[PDB]
Structures are given as C-alpha cells and as structure tokens.
Design a protein around this ligand. Structure first.
Ligand SMILES: *[C@@H]1O[C@H](CO)[C@@H](O)[C@H](O)[C@H]1NC(C)=O
Ligand SMILES: *[C@@H]1O[C@H](CO)[C@@H](O)[C@H](O)[C@H]1NC(C)=O
Ligand SMILES: *[C@@H]1O[C@H](CO)[C@@H](O)[C@H](O)[C@H]1NC(C)=O
Ligand SMILES: *[C@@H]1O[C@H](CO)[C@@H](O)[C@H](O)[C@H]1NC(C)=O
Lengths: 221, 224, 224
C-alpha cells in the first residue's frame, strides 16, 4: 500500500519551463475505475487530470495523475497530496510531499589531452561542475548561442565528494571531432542551479587557452 | 520472502586478487540456526561461512553466505547457486549466477586531464580527474597511487559506468582526486592506473606533470 | 633412476594465464604403456596427461604431461607429487615439488636507457634497452607492446636474470629491442613493461620517445 511520488526537480523545470505533478501507487491488486484527484493544503480543486495509465504486468496496478501548477507555492513549502480511491481499502490513503546548505558551484573547463589529438579522429570536451547542493542539476551545451541536440551529451548522476561532506560533483562530456575543434567550436556549457543568485554560470574556451595571450612562439624549419 | 544476487564484479576481484561470490537473502524472520550452503553444477564441497549479520529494527533478518572458488572457475562458464534452508520456508528459493558471455572487448582509452589554470588561481584546492572511456563491459576499477604507494580508498570517487551517447557498445567512467594547490607543482608522479579485462596485461597506467602541457623545447619567461 | 620436474615459472603463469607443470623422467629404456600421473596432498584426481613425446633415437626415454592447477592452490602451499609407475622400477617413486616460501621480495626499479648518439649516426639499426634491477626472486617476464599490441616473440629476447654483486639479495635483467632506425625517428609508444610479484598491479608501463632526456634548449629570458 506504499505510495511514492516524484517531485519536480529543478532540472525538469528549467528545461520545459512547465512544472507538473505526478504520483504513483504500487503494491495494489489490479482493478478498474480508479480516479486520482490532487488536493492542495488549503482545500481547493486543481486542473483536471487526464491521460490515465495502465497496470504493470507483474500483477500490480499503477495510477497516474497530471496537473498544471505554476511556481507560486512550490518555493514556499506547499504540501501537495494526491488522493487514490481503491476498492480494497475503505478509507483512501493520502501521502504528503514537501521540499527538502546552498553552495555556489564552480564550473571548470579542461582542455583535451595531447595524447588524444594525435589520433585526429575524435575530441572529448568536459564540463566539470563541483561543489553544488542539492543534486539533480541540468547542464546543456550551446554552440554560438544555439543549443545542440540532447543526444550529443549525457549528464552523469551527481555524487558526494570524498573530502567535502556536503558538496557534489558532476560531469558532462561532449563527443566531437578533432577537425572542428581547430576551427572554433567553443562549446560553452551552462549549469542550471537554484543556489546561484543568477542561476546561470557559463564559460568559454578555445584552442588558445594555455597561451598567456602575451607571446606566440612556434617552430619553423 | 525475497532473495538477492550480487555477482562478483571485476573491480571487486582486483584489489584483493581473490574472488568471493555471496548471495543475499531478505524478508526473513528473526531466528537463529541459519544454514546457507553452496554447490557447483554437479555438486561438490564448499567452504563454511561465519559472521552472521544482525536483525533490522523493523523485524527483518538478513544473512550472507561466503564462498571461495578459483579464478578460472568464474570464466570457465560454470553456474553457481546458493541453497538457503531456514525453519519457516515452505520452498527453498534459488537463484543462478554466472558470467554472461557474448560481449565485445575494446581497449580502454585513458587520458589523465590536468587541472585548469582558473582553479589554481584561488590557491585553495586542486582536482585531478582521470578520463576512462572506450571500455567494454562495465565494472572497471580505477585506483590512484602517489609515487608507488597507493593513497587512502576514501580520497577518490569513481562514477558509475554509462553508455556513450555516440557509441552503442562503449562506456565511460570518471574518477576525480582532490589535492592541495601546493601539492600540484611538486611532482609525486600522480599516476592513474586502470584495470580492465581487455588488455593483454590487463593493467595500464598514464601519468602527467606540470611540464606535460609544455612543449619541453623552449622556456620563455616574462619579467615585468 | 632420476626423476626431474619443472616448476611453473612466473614468466609463464602470467603469459598463458594457466599453470601447467610437466614431470620429466629420464634414465630409462624403451617400453610401452606407461602410467604417470600427479596427485595432491589430499589424494584426489587430476587432469589427463595426453600428448606424449616421441622417444629420442639415442636410447633415452622421455615423458611429458600437462595438468590444470589453480593459481590460488599453487600459492597456498599445497605439495604436488609426480607418481612414477614403470616396469623397470616397480616401487612407486615419490618426487615432491612445491614453491619454497620464506624469501623477501623487493619492488623492481625500471630505468629506460635511450640509445647513444654513436649509433644513430650510423643509420643502420636502432637498439632500445630496458634495464630492470632491484627485484627478487628470478624468472621475471619482460615484454614489449606497440599501442596495445604485443610484438613478435622473435624480435625481443629477455636475458636471464643475474645476481648483482653489490646487492646481497637482488637481481637484474635486460631486454633489448632491435628495430629499424627508419621507424625510430618518430616513435609511437616504445613502452616497456615488467611483470613482478612485488608490484601492486604487477605491471609497470614505462614509455620513452625521441625527446625524453632532452631538456629545454631555447631558454628565452626576454624582459620589457
Ligand atoms: C601564432 O601565429 C600563427 C600565425 O600568426 C598562427 O597560425 C598560430 O595559430 C599562432 N599560435 C597559436 C598557439 O595560436
Ligand atoms: C610572426 O608573425 C607572422 C605574421 O605576422 C606570423 O605568420 C608568424 O606565425 C609569427 N611568428 C610566430 C612564431 O607565430
Ligand atoms: C624556466 O624558466 C623559469 C622562469 O622563472 C625558471 O623558473 C625555471 O627554472 C626555468 N627552467 C629551466 C629548466 O631552465
Ligand atoms: C633559463 O632562464 C631563466 C630566466 O630567468 C633563468 O632563471 C634560468 O636559470 C635559466 N635556466 C638555464 C638552465 O639556463
């Protein structure tokens, strides 16, 4: 009879610019005619839930409920609760959810290794973000102000640092070719975190990053 | 009554050079006299186990059976299954664990990325990551050794292996190492070793230094 | 009657990833239908001993045999005996051979030695020597690789370990690499590896290129 809900993380809010609600009910016998209605703490109705789900094949029933609530009370601490009406229990079970240090992340960009440029077949550029709380952040890539497709980069799950008790680190690699890296392709990444007052921190790099921008010495035969 | 299965990963059989297969059982009554016996495909004698775990505060009992086999036994293809016979199980549960064959092997690509100059400006911390990519299958072991002698295991965290966006059968891993700013431009090797079951020697190592990025041909200095 | 045995050397265990000991019996005559097999301390059965060798034409008898022995079992200290049952000697001859424990080990130190300038001017052949010293015991496996690919066994030969006169309990071994000078101008990997028991990962990769021991030359000291 355990009911688990997935609160909308900051990564899913900044991406589509439209936060929603969704609660799931498991460990229940499969049945029919189950209505899921969301109820706020005050006691007013919400948007009409549509797009019902089905039952899991493993002799279990799953129910879903959608809503459309703007950012007016989520940041304050409003307790969202969905109501599930099942025939097995006489009294519907209600489960409430809420919003659980704010360290500013520091984005560091690392140039590709010299051993990889000799292959002249691929290039890896990372977007390192360390010291951020909480986890589940969103980092994307933009090229000359135009974001790239999500299929070209994968964001790893944040993990706690070994020495830092309350700071997390994230990684975001980008698989590109070596030929393009020599003709620009800055590949500026932006991290979306709620701890930053501006919530945006982006840095740009190019081929001439290690140069102190004072001298340019090469070798000519 | 549930029973789990944790096959011996490649990273767990390298730091100790001794394989150990254990099966986990959960949702059991808090009672003593627990007998967990292992067997082979045909049925042979195994080694006894001890150090029985305690019970959970929510009235849940758990146990683990320790076993020991050879190194080539796991790669031979022989399946193993632990037998748990308690005093309240109508039917003894069983789960088969083996090594799933039929996976392509690729040599991992190790590139020890040096820390950026912007991080060193603060002069308060330094992060050294070791990029590991192009390895298959998963469960790769990454270790840090400072001048031969290794460091504490609680000084580096290895990210979970995930498939590459552009490669359907390749994985990438990360492992950062936080050090002091004054400990970067000193030396101490700082070699990243990666253990994977794809190389002929199964062990590779890549090391850099403060002069790795320099062309080591000319020393141009600016004096104000 | 003299019965010999070849213990599995460390250079062969790491190469084939399988310990295969061979029992050789000499000082005999020409017969047929021999019966020789190995046994453990407990007295169990072993693998087959097929693939016999032909008798030498000099009226000398020779016998070979392979067996599958786990690496952990050999390192534990189990003694193996080669049972010899022949018509010439009806008495069962016992030949116990194992690994003598109780010897201190030292971490080998690899020092790459680039070729001298007296050879590059000839433009005939390039020789790369990988001197390894400070290791014990003997039977160390040293090979060469070319970007994750081992070279041919007929190209590089590892010299037999010899005792160091200054070191009371250490040994040194050499491994030359005779290659063409045309392919040595650029250099791809030119890495040297050593397989020793005292090493943590048992493999130490040391690479060398054209510009390895050459320091900076154009030390510019401009000031404005
Ligand atoms: C130095 O200048 C040349 C031509 O002015 C240019 O091609 C080269 O890229 C410069 N060096 C660097 C490191 O950008
Ligand atoms: C010197 O300047 C010329 C043109 O201004 C440029 O092509 C050349 O690369 C420069 N020298 C170096 C070492 O970059
Ligand atoms: C290179 O130049 C820097 C300039 O300060 C100096 O400190 C360093 O010792 C020089 N290195 C060599 C090998 O000459
Ligand atoms: C290289 O030049 C720098 C410039 O100050 C000097 O300090 C250093 O001693 C020089 N090194 C050598 C080996 O000449």
């Amino acid at each position: 009879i355990r009911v688990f809900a997935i609160p909308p993380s900051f990564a899913s809010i900044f991406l589509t610019k439209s936060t929603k609600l969704t609660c799931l009910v498991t460990d229940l016998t499969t049945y029919d005619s189950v209505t899921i209605s969301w109820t706020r703490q005050n006691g007013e109705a919400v948007k009409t839930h549509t797009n019902i789900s089905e039952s899991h094949p493993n002799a279990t029933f799953s129910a879903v409920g959608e809503a459309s609530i703007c950012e007016d009370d989520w940041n304050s601490g409003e307790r969202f609760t969905c109501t599930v009406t099942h025939t097995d229990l006489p009294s519907p079970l209600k489960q409430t959810i809420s919003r659980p240090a704010l360290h500013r992340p520091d984005v560091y960009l690392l140039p590709p290794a010299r051993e990889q440029l000799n292959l002249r077949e691929s290039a890896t550029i990372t977007c390192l973000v360390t010291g951020f709380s909480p986890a589940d952040v969103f980092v994307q890539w933009m090229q000359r102000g135009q974001p790239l497709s999500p299929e070209k980069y994968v964001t790893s799950a944040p993990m706690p640092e070994p020495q830092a008790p309350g700071r997390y680190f994230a990684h975001s690699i980008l698989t590109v070719s070596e030929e393009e890296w020599n003709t620009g392709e800055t590949y500026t990444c932006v991290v979306a975190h709620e701890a930053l007052p501006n919530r945006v921190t982006e840095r740009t790099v190019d081929k001439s990053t290690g140069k102190p921008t004072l001298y340019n010495v090469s070798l000519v035969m």
